[PDB]
Amino acid sequence: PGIVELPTLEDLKVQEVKVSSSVLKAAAHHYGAQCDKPNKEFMLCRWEEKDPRRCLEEGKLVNQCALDFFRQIKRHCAEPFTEYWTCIDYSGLQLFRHCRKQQAKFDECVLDKLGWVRPDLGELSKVTKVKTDRPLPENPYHSRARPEPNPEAEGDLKPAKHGSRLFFWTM
Amino acid sequence: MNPIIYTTLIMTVMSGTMLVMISSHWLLIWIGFEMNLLAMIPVLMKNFNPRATEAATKYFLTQATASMMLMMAIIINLLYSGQWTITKMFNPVAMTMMTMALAMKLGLSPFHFWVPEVTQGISLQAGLLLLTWQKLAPLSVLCQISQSINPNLMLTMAMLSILIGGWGGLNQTQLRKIMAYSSIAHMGWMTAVLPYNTTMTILNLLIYITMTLAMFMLLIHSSATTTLSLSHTWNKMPVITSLMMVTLLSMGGLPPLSGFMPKWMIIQEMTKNESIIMPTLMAMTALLNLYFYMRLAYSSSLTMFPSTNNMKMKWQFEHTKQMKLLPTMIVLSTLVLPMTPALSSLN
Amino acid sequence: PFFDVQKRLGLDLDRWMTIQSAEQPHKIPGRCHAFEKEWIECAHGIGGIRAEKECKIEFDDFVECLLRQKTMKRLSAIKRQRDKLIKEGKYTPPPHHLG
Amino acid sequence: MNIMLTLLTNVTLASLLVLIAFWLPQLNAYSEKTSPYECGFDPMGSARLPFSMKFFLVAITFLLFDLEIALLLPLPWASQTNNLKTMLTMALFLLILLAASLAYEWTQKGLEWAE
Amino acid sequence: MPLVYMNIIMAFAIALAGLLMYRSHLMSSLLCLEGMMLSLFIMSTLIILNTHFTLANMMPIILLVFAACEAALGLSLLVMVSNTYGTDYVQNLNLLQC
Amino acid sequence: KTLLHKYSDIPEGTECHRKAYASTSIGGATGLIVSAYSIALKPPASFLEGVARTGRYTFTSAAIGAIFGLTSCISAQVREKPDDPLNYFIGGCAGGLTLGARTRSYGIGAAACAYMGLTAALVKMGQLEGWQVFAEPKV
Amino acid sequence: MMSGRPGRVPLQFLPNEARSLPPPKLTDPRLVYMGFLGYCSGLIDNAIRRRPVVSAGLHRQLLYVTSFVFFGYYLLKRQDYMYALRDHDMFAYVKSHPEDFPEKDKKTYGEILEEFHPVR
Amino acid sequence: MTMYIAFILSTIFVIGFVGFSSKPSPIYGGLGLIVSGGVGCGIVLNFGGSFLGLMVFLIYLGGMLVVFGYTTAMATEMYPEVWVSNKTVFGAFVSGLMMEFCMVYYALKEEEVEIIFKFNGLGDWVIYDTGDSGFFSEEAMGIAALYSYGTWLVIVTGWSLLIGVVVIMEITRGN
Ligand SMILES: CCCCCCCCCCCCCCCCCC(=O)OC[C@H](COP(=O)(O)OCCN)OC(=O)CCCCCCCCCCCCCCCCC
Numbered sequence A: 001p002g003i004v005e006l007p008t009l010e011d012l013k014v015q016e017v018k019v020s021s022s023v024l025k026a027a028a029h030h031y032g033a034q035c036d037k038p039n040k041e042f043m044l045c046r047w048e049e050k051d052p053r054r055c056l057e058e059g060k061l062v063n064q065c066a067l068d069f070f071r072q073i074k075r076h077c078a079e080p081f082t083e084y085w086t087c088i089d090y091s092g093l094q095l096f097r098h099c100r101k102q103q104a105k106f107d108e109c110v111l112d113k114l115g116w117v118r119p120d121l122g123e124l125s126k127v128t129k130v131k132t133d134r135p136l137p138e139n140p141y142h143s144r145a146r147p148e149p150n151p152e153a154e155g156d157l158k159p160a161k162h163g164s165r166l167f168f169w170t171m
Numbered sequence B: 001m002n003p004i005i006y007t008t009l010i011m012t013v014m015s016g017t018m019l020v021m022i023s024s025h026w027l028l029i030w031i032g033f034e035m036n037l038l039a040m041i042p043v044l045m046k047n048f049n050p051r052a053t054e055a056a057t058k059y060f061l062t063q064a065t066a067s068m069m070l071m072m073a074i075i076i077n078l079l080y081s082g083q084w085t086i087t088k089m090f091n092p093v094a095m096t097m098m099t100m101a102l103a104m105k106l107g108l109s110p111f112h113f114w115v116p117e118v119t120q121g122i123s124l125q126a127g128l129l130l131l132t133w134q135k136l137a138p139l140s141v142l143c144q145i146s147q148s149i150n151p152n153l154m155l156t157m158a159m160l161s162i163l164i165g166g167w168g169g170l171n172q173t174q175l176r177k178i179m180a181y182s183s184i185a186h187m188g189w190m191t192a193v194l195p196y197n198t199t200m201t202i203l204n205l206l207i208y209i210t211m212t213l214a215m216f217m218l219l220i221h222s223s224a225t226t227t228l229s230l231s232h233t234w235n236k237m238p239v240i241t242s243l244m245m246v247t248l249l250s251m252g253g254l255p256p257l258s259g260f261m262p263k264w265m266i267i268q269e270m271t272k273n274e275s276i277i278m279p280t281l282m283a284m285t286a287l288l289n290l291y292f293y294m295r296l297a298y299s300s301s302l303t304m305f306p307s308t309n310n311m312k313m314k315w316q317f318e319h320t321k322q323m324k325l326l327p328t329m330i331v332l333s334t335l336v337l338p339m340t341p342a343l344s345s346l347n
Numbered sequence C: 001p002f003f004d005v006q007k008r009l010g011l012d013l014d015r016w017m018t019i020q021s022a023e024q025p026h027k028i029p030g031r032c033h034a035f036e037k038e039w040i041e042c043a044h045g046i047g048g049i050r051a052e053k054e055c056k057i058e059f060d061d062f063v064e065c066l067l068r069q070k071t072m073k074r075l076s077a078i079k080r081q082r083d084k085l086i087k088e089g090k091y092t093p094p095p096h097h098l099g
Numbered sequence D: 001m002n003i004m005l006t007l008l009t010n011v012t013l014a015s016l017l018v019l020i021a022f023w024l025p026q027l028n029a030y031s032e033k034t035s036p037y038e039c040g041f042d043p044m045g046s047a048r049l050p051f052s053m054k055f056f057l058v059a060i061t062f063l064l065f066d067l068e069i070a071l072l073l074p075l076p077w078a079s080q081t082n083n084l085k086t087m088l089t090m091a092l093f094l095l096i097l098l099a100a101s102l103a104y105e106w107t108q109k110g111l112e113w114a115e
Numbered sequence E: 001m002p003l004v005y006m007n008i009i010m011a012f013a014i015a016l017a018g019l020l021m022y023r024s025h026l027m028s029s030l031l032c033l034e035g036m037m038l039s040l041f042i043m044s045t046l047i048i049l050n051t052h053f054t055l056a057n058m059m060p061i062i063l064l065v066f067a068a069c070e071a072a073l074g075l076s077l078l079v080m081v082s083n084t085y086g087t088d089y090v091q092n093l094n095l096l097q098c
Numbered sequence F: 001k002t003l004l005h006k007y008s009d010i011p012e013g014t015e016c017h018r019k020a021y022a023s024t025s026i027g028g029a030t031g032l033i034v035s036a037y038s039i040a041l042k043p044p045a046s047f048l049e050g051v052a053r054t055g056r057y058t059f060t061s062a063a064i065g066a067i068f069g070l071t072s073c074i075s076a077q078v079r080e081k082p083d084d085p086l087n088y089f090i091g092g093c094a095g096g097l098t099l100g101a102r103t104r105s106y107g108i109g110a111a112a113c114a115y116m117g118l119t120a121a122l123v124k125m126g127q128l129e130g131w132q133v134f135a136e137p138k139v
Numbered sequence G: 001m002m003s004g005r006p007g008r009v010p011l012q013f014l015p016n017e018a019r020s021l022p023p024p025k026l027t028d029p030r031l032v033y034m035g036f037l038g039y040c041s042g043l044i045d046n047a048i049r050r051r052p053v054v055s056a057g058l059h060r061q062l063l064y065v066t067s068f069v070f071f072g073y074y075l076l077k078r079q080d081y082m083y084a085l086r087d088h089d090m091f092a093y094v095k096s097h098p099e100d101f102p103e104k105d106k107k108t109y110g111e112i113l114e115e116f117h118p119v120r
Numbered sequence H: 001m002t003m004y005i006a007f008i009l010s011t012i013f014v015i016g017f018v019g020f021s022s023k024p025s026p027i028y029g030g031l032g033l034i035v036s037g038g039v040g041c042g043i044v045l046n047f048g049g050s051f052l053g054l055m056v057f058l059i060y061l062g063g064m065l066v067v068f069g070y071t072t073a074m075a076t077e078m079y080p081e082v083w084v085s086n087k088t089v090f091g092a093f094v095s096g097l098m099m100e101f102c103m104v105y106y107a108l109k110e111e112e113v114e115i116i117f118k119f120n121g122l123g124d125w126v127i128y129d130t131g132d133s134g135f136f137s138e139e140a141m142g143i144a145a146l147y148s149y150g151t152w153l154v155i156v157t158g159w160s161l162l163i164g165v166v167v168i169m170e171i172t173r174g175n
């Protein structure tokens, strides 16, 4: 009953980040607060537009905005990145608790090299207001027209005409 | 059994039935049925006679099977609709599935085979509870889901209920078996009108409640379980046999007695629903109940059966029971026909 | 229910769980939250008789959402014709089929 | 993949370990050798009789007790709920009723099972 | 509907038949009864897990803890029958008759 | 009710063999149902006489079903009156007589003649007029 | 059937808007019959307990009449409510559905051709 | 193979059910039932129902059926009624191995099996849903709601269990 419209593979050939999981996790805190604006725009689209195909343009933007976050640290102290994500990779659960010294060394550069700051606890979990230009969807669920409710009761109650009206009972 | 334990056991049985009538969730409906079952068996076990053990075992096997079979009707409806709300369900096989599942609890179709035997084994007071209170819970579900029922399937189950329930009643000596066969016959009358209009399905319920409380507590007051034992009660207390014959006539449905009010309204409804052959046949089978009703009435008070010289002690002493609510029970169960238009209150 | 005490005194006993689009732990969804929400709001204040036919579209869509009968039949017919064709060597699956 | 593979390996290990414990010892059983041992004397024909109620009574109490504890496995995740007060009250209820069932069962003889 | 759902549904139906088609051991009958609920417990888990009815993960335990309660009643009646009669036969469990 | 639909599809007093086949199928199925019940409630002590019991019940019910099949159809064929209720009445009595033959008693056959013939008229009465036994909920 | 009408608050024996109806008059013939039922219970109440029926425990059957009358009275108001309610939304429906209730034509018996059957 | 692994577990579930439903010896029926009890857990495990799957092992395999063995040890009909003892049980066991073998072949060929319901014989894996559960196990969060939203069920389930122990001793007390 229609077409499941799918985007062509052309727009899907977007640059994808090629890094192991521990690389993301090691720099996750220093990535979330510093690339929030496109991230919030994309994920606002995901929950508002409610359709995957609508947020394709933003989908490549966050991936792109990940790459220019993953490039200056190469033109800066990529060496403290190496052992830090290596040590995190050694952990089975990628626990930060064991590898804190390399975290400090990693944090020391970005405080001065790019001048970033480590986000505090709860800061990343804060709900943030994202400023966008796209209009809000009208019917994200594509709802149809709604059946009209049956008319309500109205008018004052009057005594039953001629009583119960059940066989010979007068009242 | 300790009275405090007995009171609690009845309290849960009442609450379990109350739970069924007040639950909008199918799982909770099942919860009420099972925990009502969970406390029904010990009450039947109060006397603890080998006949009772046979009766309780029979009662549990059929009720547990029906309740377990009820789960699939919920599960299948869940599977095809994902709705736990007790409403018009969405599967003919599931609708069919529960209809016999609930019918076995009520005992209308051949399912009814447990109803007589369990009553025979267990005590008179327990039979009163089983045949009156334990019929509200299965009826409560049917009233709510009446809009989804297949008319042919339910009308049939009602038909064999009055048909067989009345037919075998002619061949019962023990009063307990007579009452159960009457119960199965009365089960058909309410169930027949159930798909059409639920209002007088209830009206039949409270009315049918009234005689069965009236009859059983009269029988308990008589302390008699057989026809011959009932016959001797004329010598001790002729008055009680007089009221019992009024209720026996009333429960038979002769006007202007109360028992005519349900049947009259039942015939009126399906006549409005263009079903006119169906009411006629049930009315014809209604006389079948009246026959052994008359036979008991003939043995009880209309005639005067021989007594035993040992009855003379019974004259000297007196009854210690309080038969609570018996006075208002029979009066409300024999002359309420003039107050028929009050059924709109049920609506 | 037969006696809707829940409505009278307004204590929620079971209806929190009767349908899957209600409040859920950690606000995580069911499989067909989108569909059943549409069907529910379609069939509110309407009545069982009218909602059976008027909101039919929202129903079978929602039923198909959780049963997934015709979708599975669609895949079955796709797969059935595939093996009825590739076994004859008429079309060869591309590399992305096999990785 | 590995789970039933681990289950599979143990069962074969057990079966072969009894297999080489069964065919290897060169079974040479006779009639008196296979006869039941009853303290060195004649068996009178038994092990087919009911055993009162105490063994059954404790089994049912254990079964009922096992069912309530089944209701309270999810407590470790229950503590992670948002509304602890309702969870604290409710979990306490199951335990005190578990106590009450034990309390009644104790008071009305019960655990002092029949002899 | 997926092939597996037949396997539980047919499992119940054949379990249902064994519960009704009797023999001489109502002990064996109780086995079909608790097997009957096991399929009910098993199948209920499939839909609820499949459809992500998170709050409905409730009832597989709830159905278990109540179906298990009937075992307490049923097995207790078993020994009661096996005390006034000694055995668990069903043909002899007909003292009611009339 | 496809099996029952077979009888209704064939016009009255036309293709008598089809009507007889449809009628005897109704009787055979009905005899099977009651025979299976009788085996259930009443134990057929030995299996072989159990097949004898269901054989008798099915053979009887088929005979009434078959005989009513011809007598109803041929009478309508002979008298060229399909709407006439008497067509079923003679067939109904004819079926009742066959029951008497199977039980070997004139009294039961005579009783079955009157009752079944009356009902056979009544069901035809309903088919012509439009009587419904299991009426759908109308009001 | 009124099982799900809009506004029915559950477990409400006498809804408030039912007060807009003429209350049953204190000697309504239906009400006194309800009082009859209370008395008729009283006479037999002494009968089972083997007491001097009519003149036996004036307090006992006196309470019976009182209880039956009040429980009767509230029942009658509730009974009058549904019949008034049943007729009310009835009338509101037919005005809302004129097409399903045609006004049958006005023809006198003069033009009506009613065939006549002699008794002979 | 692993294509239709859940097809397998469902199959032993059926034959395990046919085992005890064929009314064999109550211990042997218990053996057949626990076999079905064991295999059924794997079906739930394959769907992610680890907590539900492990419970039936705990309170149904190691739970109910253990006390079932007591009554079997209490009943002890004078001779074992193992499969060789009777011929109807063989017929019941043999029969119950046919129709489910028939309809799987019916379902494996054209998949249009219409017994009672319409049913697809497609691979078990299809009906699975794709989507991450994050860090919260959906099964665990559902059950833990016992003490958050399942307040009403907790009272009724607890109260019935309390009534469960009062009845059991009362019926077994033998007056
Ligand atoms: C719808 C049709 C009819 C349906 C009901 C029919 C019922 C009877 C049918 C026949 C029954 C079987 C045959 C007869 C059985 C008799 C049973 C019996 O016990 O009889 C003997 C018994 C002896 O009497 P006893 O109990 O001693 O009481 C005497 C009064 N104190 O007698 C009795 O116990 C009977 C006691 C009767 C007491 C009557 C009291 C009447 C009081 C009237 C008050 C009027 C007030 C008017 C006020 C006017 C102003 C407002």
Ligand SMILES: CCCCCCCCCCCCCCCCCC(=O)OC[C@H](COP(=O)(O)OCCN)OC(=O)CCCCCCCCCCCCCCCCC
Residues within 6 Å of the ligand: F004, F007, F023, F024, F026, F027, F030, F031, F034, F056, F057, F060, F061, F064, F065, F068, F069, F103
């Ligand atoms: C227009 C379409 C149809 C055209 C064909 C005509 C209708 C179908 C054929 C006729 C069916 C009704 C006639 C009776 C058939 C069953 C007869 C039967 O069961 O006989 C066996 C037995 C009677 O003998 P018994 O009392 O057992 O004595 C010997 C004991 N050794 O039985 C018994 O003991 C039990 C009592 C008899 C069985 C119960 C009643 C069966 C009939 C119910 C109505 C069936 C209506 C079928 C047609 C409408 C529905 C499709």
